[PDB]
């Protein structure tokens, strides 16, 4: 696997045309505060094609 190629799987809102959001900061899907640490419903926003 080549893991160097990444895509965003999680965002709070959809991009407008040519919006270029590079931010890697940890997302919150849950009603409970994720405090910037990884977990269930507290996902890292990118994924790798491998």
């Amino acid at each position: 696997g080549n893991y160097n190629y990444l895509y965003r799987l999680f965002r709070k809102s959809n991009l407008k045309p040519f919006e270029r959001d590079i931010s890697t900061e940890i997302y919150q899907a849950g009603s409970t505060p994720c405090n910037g640490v990884k977990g269930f419903n507290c996902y890292f926003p990118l994924q790798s094609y491998g």
Binding site: R20, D21, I22, S23, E25
Partner: protein, 43 residues
């Protein structure tokens, strides 16, 4: 007045746009900037 800052959060975690008149010149940058807490230029 010598420049402008634009963006969403202005705290490096997402990108920001800086525009400055450097006396004769004009400069534009987009970066993961962390600014100082009270932005101004010492002259």
């Amino acid at each position: 007045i010598r420049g402008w800052i634009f963006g969403t959060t202005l705290d490096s975690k997402t990108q920001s746009l800086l525009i400055v008149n450097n006396a004769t010149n004009v400069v534009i940058k987009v970066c993961e900037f962390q600014f100082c807490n009270d932005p101004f230029l010492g002259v």
